[PDB]
Amino acid sequence: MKINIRDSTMVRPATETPITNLWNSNVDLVIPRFHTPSVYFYRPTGASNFFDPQVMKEALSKALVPFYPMAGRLKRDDDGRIEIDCNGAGVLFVVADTPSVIDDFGDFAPTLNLRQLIPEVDHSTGIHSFPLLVLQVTFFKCGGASLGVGMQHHAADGFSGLHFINTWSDMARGLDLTIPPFIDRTLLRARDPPQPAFHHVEYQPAPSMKIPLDPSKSGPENTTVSIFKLTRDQKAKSKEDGNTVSYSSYEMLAGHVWRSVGKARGLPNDQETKLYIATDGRSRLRPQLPPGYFGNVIFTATPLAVAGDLLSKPTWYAAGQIHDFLVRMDDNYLRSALDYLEMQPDLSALVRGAHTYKCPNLGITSWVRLPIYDADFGWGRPIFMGPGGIPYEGLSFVLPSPTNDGSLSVAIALQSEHMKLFEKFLFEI
């Protein structure tokens, strides 16, 4: 598609913010190097001032006073550890036009051309040379608009990122700050001395294919991205084969996706397959994190199975493996995990910038509980919000319904031929 940039502004906090160096916990360091992409789409109201850039920039500068680290930069301290240089250098805000219309995105499958709706960042020069947050409003021919978001997660995770975007929109509507950000990640400081109590499977290497796969076709350029609606349901039946154990809706769904992906990939009976589940630690850490905690708190649950078992046993078996790993992740385990991380020489080497989400493994994250449609800047809630292009194969997202309409969507990247079979997705037998 064709993007025409009309304006590009570095937006700074509306008033003076603290000049300071913000420490990063171990969880703020096991972080992808690139900016994480997300996109929102809005229908026109028909009003002339729809997404007025002036209103947007003014409210952005305002939100950047309590969320001031967002306007900072990356630096390393004396020990070489990355920290946030809170210098209020600011946030990139781009305005664009395109002859395309929103309806061209059809089902809003998060294809990679979505990246054109988010500003590009050059990571080639230093870590201190790019804003932590880049933003783009693009006006479509149809009168509609997208908001493109690129955020470097050393600043914070997607949950705190949402807190910021929603606050920004509240302010565009002339409203007040509701939950003030809490800015201090020493709450996740590791114990001294570090004392891990577990062997943490979730930091071990992913299983490889016992029999290596044809690099292409089956690489970057054989990867399709699709989205699928599940229309409720359309947890039951976990009663299959007389199983009495009750599993949650999330457990059953994640197990189903994991299993369906295994089936679609034709995994041999003896092939191990690992599932990586984004798990929010805010509700599990037991001194209990302040509301508005600004930072990363996303841990990962990694249940494993042999495909022979995963694919021949009922879906509740998959849900069971998942549940077993989700249940072990209480404060004691997460504290253990922080201590484990503390002893590793190089935290950046533990980042799954995968590579490892490749057949036979899978990542899944659910945004079902997240306030992803609350960003009303004064012209209505978005008709869609999703990841801004799934980078590579083996990543999946569960998205709540914009209308609810208790429907769910599964957005996922797989190899071309695997994707067709993934239509295994649509039978609970």
Coordinates of C-alpha atoms in Angstrom, one line a residue:
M1 CA 0.0 0.0 0.0
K2 CA 1.1 3.6 -0.4
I3 CA 1.7 5.8 2.6
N4 CA 2.1 9.6 2.2
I5 CA 3.6 11.4 5.2
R6 CA 2.2 14.8 5.7
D7 CA 3.7 15.7 9.1
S8 CA 6.2 14.5 11.6
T9 CA 6.6 15.9 15.1
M10 CA 8.7 15.1 18.1
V11 CA 6.2 15.6 20.9
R12 CA 7.6 16.5 24.3
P13 CA 6.0 16.5 27.8
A14 CA 3.7 19.5 28.2
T15 CA 5.6 20.7 31.3
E16 CA 8.9 19.9 33.0
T17 CA 9.3 16.2 34.1
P18 CA 11.9 14.7 36.3
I19 CA 15.4 14.3 34.9
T20 CA 16.4 10.9 36.2
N21 CA 17.7 7.4 35.4
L22 CA 15.0 4.7 35.8
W23 CA 16.3 1.3 36.9
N24 CA 15.2 -1.8 34.9
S25 CA 14.4 -5.1 36.6
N26 CA 15.4 -8.5 35.2
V27 CA 12.0 -8.7 33.5
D28 CA 12.4 -5.3 31.9
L29 CA 15.6 -6.7 30.4
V30 CA 14.5 -10.0 28.9
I31 CA 12.9 -7.9 26.2
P32 CA 12.9 -8.0 22.3
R33 CA 15.4 -5.4 20.8
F34 CA 12.9 -4.0 18.3
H35 CA 9.8 -1.8 18.8
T36 CA 6.6 -3.9 19.4
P37 CA 3.9 -3.0 16.9
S38 CA 0.1 -2.5 17.5
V39 CA -2.7 -1.0 15.4
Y40 CA -6.2 0.5 16.0
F41 CA -8.7 1.2 13.3
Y42 CA -11.5 3.9 13.5
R43 CA -14.6 4.6 11.3
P44 CA -15.2 8.3 10.5
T45 CA -18.0 9.9 12.4
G46 CA -18.5 12.3 9.5
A47 CA -17.2 15.3 11.5
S48 CA -14.5 17.5 10.0
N49 CA -12.3 17.4 13.1
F50 CA -12.0 13.6 13.1
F51 CA -8.7 12.8 14.8
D52 CA -7.6 16.5 14.7
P53 CA -3.7 16.2 14.9
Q54 CA -3.6 19.3 17.1
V55 CA -6.0 17.7 19.6
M56 CA -3.9 14.5 19.4
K57 CA -0.5 16.2 19.9
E58 CA -1.8 18.4 22.8
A59 CA -3.3 15.5 24.6
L60 CA -0.1 13.4 23.9
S61 CA 2.1 16.0 25.5
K62 CA -0.2 16.1 28.6
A63 CA -0.1 12.3 29.0
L64 CA 3.7 12.4 28.8
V65 CA 3.9 14.4 32.1
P66 CA 2.8 11.5 34.4
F67 CA 4.1 8.9 31.9
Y68 CA 7.4 10.8 31.5
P69 CA 9.7 7.7 31.1
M70 CA 7.8 7.1 27.9
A71 CA 9.4 10.3 26.5
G72 CA 12.9 9.1 27.6
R73 CA 15.7 7.2 25.9
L74 CA 17.8 4.1 26.5
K75 CA 21.2 4.2 28.1
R76 CA 23.5 1.8 29.9
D77 CA 24.8 2.5 33.5
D78 CA 28.4 2.0 34.6
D79 CA 28.0 -1.8 34.8
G80 CA 26.6 -1.8 31.3
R81 CA 23.0 -2.5 32.3
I82 CA 20.3 -0.9 30.2
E83 CA 18.2 1.8 32.0
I84 CA 15.8 4.5 31.0
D85 CA 17.4 7.9 30.5
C86 CA 14.4 10.1 31.5
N87 CA 15.4 13.2 29.6
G88 CA 12.0 14.1 28.2
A89 CA 13.4 14.1 24.6
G90 CA 10.0 12.9 23.6
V91 CA 7.8 10.8 21.4
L92 CA 7.5 10.6 17.6
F93 CA 4.1 11.5 16.2
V94 CA 3.5 11.1 12.4
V95 CA 0.5 12.0 10.3
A96 CA -0.1 10.1 7.1
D97 CA -2.6 9.7 4.2
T98 CA -3.3 6.7 2.0
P99 CA -5.5 6.1 -1.1
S100 CA -6.4 2.7 0.4
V101 CA -9.5 2.2 2.4
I102 CA -9.8 0.5 5.7
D103 CA -12.1 -2.2 4.2
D104 CA -9.1 -3.4 2.1
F105 CA -7.8 -5.2 5.3
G106 CA -10.9 -7.4 5.1
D107 CA -11.0 -9.5 8.2
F108 CA -8.1 -7.5 9.8
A109 CA -5.7 -10.5 9.6
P110 CA -2.6 -8.9 11.1
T111 CA -0.5 -9.1 7.8
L112 CA 2.9 -7.6 7.7
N113 CA 1.9 -4.6 5.6
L114 CA 0.3 -3.3 8.8
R115 CA 3.9 -2.2 9.6
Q116 CA 3.4 0.6 7.1
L117 CA 0.9 2.1 9.6
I118 CA 3.5 2.3 12.3
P119 CA 6.6 4.5 12.0
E120 CA 10.0 2.9 11.1
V121 CA 12.8 3.0 13.6
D122 CA 16.5 2.7 12.8
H123 CA 18.2 0.6 15.4
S124 CA 21.5 0.6 13.5
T125 CA 22.8 3.7 15.3
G126 CA 23.0 3.6 19.1
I127 CA 20.4 2.5 21.6
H128 CA 20.1 6.1 22.7
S129 CA 19.2 7.4 19.3
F130 CA 15.5 6.5 19.0
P131 CA 12.4 7.4 21.0
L132 CA 10.9 4.6 23.1
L133 CA 7.5 5.3 21.5
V134 CA 6.6 6.1 17.9
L135 CA 3.0 6.9 16.8
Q136 CA 1.3 7.3 13.5
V137 CA -2.2 8.4 12.6
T138 CA -3.0 7.5 8.9
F139 CA -6.1 8.9 7.2
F140 CA -7.7 6.5 4.7
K141 CA -9.6 7.5 1.5
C142 CA -12.8 6.2 3.1
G143 CA -12.6 8.9 5.8
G144 CA -11.5 6.3 8.4
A145 CA -8.2 6.3 10.4
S146 CA -5.7 4.0 12.0
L147 CA -3.5 4.7 15.0
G148 CA -0.2 2.9 14.7
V149 CA 1.9 2.2 17.8
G150 CA 5.5 1.1 18.1
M151 CA 6.8 0.8 21.6
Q152 CA 10.2 -0.4 22.8
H153 CA 9.4 -2.7 25.7
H154 CA 12.4 -1.8 27.8
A155 CA 10.0 1.0 28.7
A156 CA 7.1 -1.2 29.8
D157 CA 5.0 -4.2 28.8
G158 CA 1.9 -4.2 26.7
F159 CA -0.3 -3.8 29.8
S160 CA 1.4 -0.6 30.9
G161 CA 1.4 0.5 27.3
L162 CA -2.4 0.2 27.2
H163 CA -2.6 2.2 30.4
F164 CA -0.7 5.0 28.6
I165 CA -2.7 4.9 25.3
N166 CA -6.0 4.9 27.2
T167 CA -4.9 7.8 29.4
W168 CA -3.8 9.7 26.3
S169 CA -7.3 9.2 24.8
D170 CA -9.0 10.2 28.1
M171 CA -7.1 13.4 27.9
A172 CA -8.0 14.0 24.3
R173 CA -11.6 13.9 25.6
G174 CA -10.7 16.5 28.2
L175 CA -10.8 14.0 31.1
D176 CA -8.5 13.6 34.1
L177 CA -5.8 11.1 34.9
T178 CA -7.6 8.2 36.6
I179 CA -4.9 5.7 37.7
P180 CA -1.6 7.5 38.1
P181 CA 1.4 5.5 37.0
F182 CA 3.6 4.0 39.7
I183 CA 7.2 4.3 38.5
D184 CA 9.6 2.1 40.5
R185 CA 10.7 -1.3 39.2
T186 CA 12.8 -2.1 42.3
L187 CA 9.7 -4.0 43.5
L188 CA 11.0 -6.8 41.2
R189 CA 14.5 -6.6 42.5
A190 CA 16.0 -10.1 42.9
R191 CA 16.8 -11.3 46.4
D192 CA 20.3 -11.0 47.8
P193 CA 21.8 -13.5 47.7
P194 CA 19.8 -14.9 44.7
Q195 CA 18.2 -18.2 45.7
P196 CA 16.3 -20.1 43.0
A197 CA 14.0 -22.8 44.4
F198 CA 13.1 -24.4 41.1
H199 CA 14.4 -25.7 37.8
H200 CA 12.8 -23.2 35.5
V201 CA 11.7 -25.0 32.3
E202 CA 10.5 -21.7 30.9
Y203 CA 14.1 -20.6 30.4
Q204 CA 15.4 -23.8 28.8
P205 CA 15.9 -24.1 25.0
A206 CA 12.9 -25.0 22.8
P207 CA 12.7 -28.5 21.4
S208 CA 14.1 -28.9 17.9
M209 CA 12.6 -31.0 15.1
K210 CA 14.0 -34.6 15.5
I211 CA 14.1 -34.6 11.7
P212 CA 15.1 -31.2 10.3
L213 CA 12.6 -29.4 8.0
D214 CA 13.0 -28.0 4.5
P215 CA 14.2 -24.4 5.1
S216 CA 12.2 -23.3 2.0
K217 CA 9.7 -23.5 1.1
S218 CA 8.8 -23.2 4.8
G219 CA 10.6 -20.0 5.8
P220 CA 9.9 -16.3 6.2
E221 CA 8.5 -16.2 2.7
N222 CA 6.2 -19.2 3.1
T223 CA 4.6 -17.8 6.1
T224 CA 0.9 -16.8 6.0
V225 CA -1.0 -14.7 8.6
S226 CA -4.7 -15.3 9.1
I227 CA -7.4 -14.5 11.7
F228 CA -10.3 -16.8 12.7
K229 CA -13.5 -16.0 14.5
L230 CA -14.9 -18.3 17.2
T231 CA -18.5 -17.4 17.8
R232 CA -19.3 -18.9 21.2
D233 CA -18.7 -22.0 21.1
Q234 CA -19.1 -22.3 17.9
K235 CA -14.9 -25.0 28.1
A236 CA -17.3 -27.6 27.0
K237 CA -16.9 -30.3 26.3
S238 CA -14.1 -31.0 28.6
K239 CA -16.3 -33.8 29.8
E240 CA -15.1 -35.9 26.8
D241 CA -14.2 -39.5 27.6
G242 CA -15.6 -39.1 31.2
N243 CA -13.1 -36.6 32.3
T244 CA -14.3 -34.9 35.4
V245 CA -11.6 -32.2 35.8
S246 CA -12.9 -28.8 35.2
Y247 CA -10.7 -26.5 33.1
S248 CA -11.1 -22.8 32.4
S249 CA -12.2 -21.3 29.1
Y250 CA -8.7 -20.0 28.5
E251 CA -7.1 -23.4 29.3
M252 CA -9.5 -25.2 26.9
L253 CA -9.0 -22.6 24.1
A254 CA -5.2 -22.5 24.4
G255 CA -5.1 -26.3 24.5
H256 CA -7.3 -26.4 21.4
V257 CA -5.1 -24.0 19.5
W258 CA -1.9 -25.8 20.5
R259 CA -3.4 -29.1 19.5
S260 CA -4.8 -27.8 16.2
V261 CA -1.4 -26.3 15.3
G262 CA 0.2 -29.6 16.1
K263 CA -2.3 -31.4 13.8
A264 CA -1.9 -28.9 11.0
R265 CA 1.9 -29.2 11.1
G266 CA 1.7 -33.0 10.8
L267 CA 4.0 -33.5 13.9
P268 CA 5.4 -37.1 14.2
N269 CA 4.2 -39.1 17.3
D270 CA 7.7 -38.9 18.8
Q271 CA 8.1 -35.1 18.3
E272 CA 8.1 -32.9 21.4
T273 CA 6.2 -29.6 21.1
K274 CA 6.5 -26.7 23.6
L275 CA 3.8 -24.0 24.1
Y276 CA 4.8 -20.6 25.3
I277 CA 2.0 -18.7 27.2
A278 CA 2.3 -15.0 28.1
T279 CA 1.3 -14.9 31.7
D280 CA 0.8 -11.6 33.6
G281 CA 2.5 -11.5 37.0
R282 CA 0.6 -8.6 38.3
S283 CA -2.0 -10.9 39.9
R284 CA 0.4 -13.5 41.1
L285 CA 3.3 -11.6 42.8
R286 CA 2.1 -11.5 46.5
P287 CA 3.3 -8.3 48.0
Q288 CA 0.8 -7.3 45.2
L289 CA 1.9 -4.7 42.7
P290 CA 0.5 -1.1 42.8
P291 CA -2.2 -0.4 40.3
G292 CA -0.6 1.5 37.5
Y293 CA 2.7 -0.2 38.1
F294 CA 4.8 1.0 35.1
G295 CA 7.1 -1.7 33.8
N296 CA 7.2 -5.3 32.5
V297 CA 5.5 -8.0 34.5
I298 CA 4.9 -10.6 31.8
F299 CA 6.3 -14.1 32.6
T300 CA 6.0 -17.2 30.5
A301 CA 4.4 -20.6 31.2
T302 CA 5.9 -23.4 29.0
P303 CA 4.0 -26.7 29.1
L304 CA 5.5 -29.4 26.9
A305 CA 4.1 -32.6 25.3
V306 CA 5.0 -35.3 22.9
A307 CA 2.8 -34.9 19.8
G308 CA 1.8 -38.6 20.0
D309 CA 0.0 -37.7 23.3
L310 CA -1.1 -34.2 22.5
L311 CA -2.8 -35.1 19.3
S312 CA -4.4 -38.5 20.0
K313 CA -5.7 -37.7 23.5
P314 CA -8.7 -35.4 24.0
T315 CA -8.3 -31.6 24.2
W316 CA -8.6 -31.7 28.0
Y317 CA -5.3 -33.5 28.1
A318 CA -3.7 -30.4 26.5
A319 CA -5.7 -28.1 28.8
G320 CA -4.3 -30.2 31.7
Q321 CA -0.7 -29.7 30.8
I322 CA -1.4 -26.0 30.5
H323 CA -3.2 -25.9 33.8
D324 CA -0.4 -27.7 35.6
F325 CA 2.1 -25.0 34.5
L326 CA -0.2 -22.1 35.1
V327 CA -1.0 -23.3 38.7
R328 CA 2.7 -23.6 39.7
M329 CA 3.3 -19.9 39.0
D330 CA 2.6 -18.3 42.3
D331 CA 4.7 -15.6 44.1
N332 CA 7.2 -18.2 45.3
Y333 CA 7.9 -19.6 41.8
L334 CA 8.0 -16.1 40.3
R335 CA 10.5 -14.9 43.0
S336 CA 12.5 -18.0 42.3
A337 CA 12.4 -17.0 38.6
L338 CA 13.7 -13.5 39.3
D339 CA 16.6 -15.0 41.3
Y340 CA 17.4 -17.5 38.4
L341 CA 17.5 -14.5 36.0
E342 CA 19.8 -12.7 38.4
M343 CA 22.5 -15.4 38.1
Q344 CA 22.5 -15.4 34.3
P345 CA 25.5 -13.6 32.7
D346 CA 23.6 -12.1 29.8
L347 CA 19.9 -11.5 30.0
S348 CA 19.5 -10.4 26.4
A349 CA 20.6 -13.9 25.4
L350 CA 17.4 -15.3 27.0
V351 CA 15.2 -13.4 24.7
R352 CA 13.1 -15.6 22.4
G353 CA 13.5 -13.4 19.3
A354 CA 12.6 -16.7 17.7
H355 CA 13.9 -18.7 15.8
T356 CA 12.3 -20.9 18.5
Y357 CA 8.7 -20.3 17.5
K358 CA 9.2 -22.5 14.5
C359 CA 7.8 -25.9 14.0
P360 CA 7.4 -27.7 16.4
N361 CA 6.7 -25.0 19.0
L362 CA 4.1 -22.3 19.5
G363 CA 3.5 -19.0 21.3
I364 CA 0.2 -17.8 22.4
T365 CA -0.9 -14.6 24.2
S366 CA -4.4 -13.6 25.1
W367 CA -5.5 -9.9 25.1
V368 CA -9.0 -11.0 26.1
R369 CA -8.8 -9.4 29.5
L370 CA -7.1 -6.3 28.3
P371 CA -8.8 -2.9 27.8
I372 CA -7.8 -2.8 24.1
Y373 CA -11.0 -0.9 22.9
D374 CA -11.0 1.8 25.5
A375 CA -8.9 4.2 23.4
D376 CA -11.7 6.7 22.5
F377 CA -10.0 9.9 21.5
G378 CA -13.4 11.7 21.1
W379 CA -14.5 10.1 17.9
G380 CA -15.6 6.7 19.2
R381 CA -14.0 3.3 20.2
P382 CA -11.9 1.5 17.6
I383 CA -13.6 -1.1 15.4
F384 CA -10.4 -3.2 15.7
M385 CA -7.2 -3.5 17.7
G386 CA -4.5 -6.1 17.2
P387 CA -0.8 -6.8 16.9
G388 CA 0.7 -4.7 14.1
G389 CA 1.9 -7.6 11.9
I390 CA 2.9 -10.9 13.3
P391 CA 6.7 -11.0 12.6
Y392 CA 7.2 -14.7 12.1
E393 CA 5.7 -18.2 12.1
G394 CA 4.5 -19.8 15.3
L395 CA 3.0 -16.8 17.1
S396 CA -0.7 -16.5 17.9
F397 CA -2.9 -14.0 19.6
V398 CA -6.4 -14.3 21.1
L399 CA -8.4 -11.1 20.7
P400 CA -11.7 -10.2 22.4
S401 CA -14.7 -9.0 20.3
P402 CA -14.9 -5.3 19.5
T403 CA -18.7 -5.5 19.9
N404 CA -19.0 -8.4 22.4
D405 CA -21.1 -10.3 20.9
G406 CA -19.2 -12.8 23.1
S407 CA -17.0 -13.8 20.2
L408 CA -13.2 -14.4 20.1
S409 CA -10.6 -14.1 17.4
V410 CA -7.4 -16.1 16.9
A411 CA -4.7 -14.4 14.8
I412 CA -1.8 -16.6 13.9
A413 CA 1.2 -17.0 11.6
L414 CA 2.0 -20.5 10.2
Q415 CA 3.6 -21.9 7.1
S416 CA 1.4 -21.7 4.0
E417 CA 0.4 -25.3 3.7
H418 CA 0.0 -25.7 7.5
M419 CA -2.3 -22.7 7.5
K420 CA -4.9 -24.5 5.3
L421 CA -5.0 -27.5 7.5
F422 CA -5.3 -25.3 10.6
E423 CA -8.9 -25.3 9.6
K424 CA -8.7 -28.2 12.2
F425 CA -9.5 -25.2 14.3
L426 CA -13.2 -25.3 13.7
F427 CA -14.5 -28.6 15.3
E428 CA -15.0 -29.4 19.0
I429 CA -16.2 -32.8 17.6

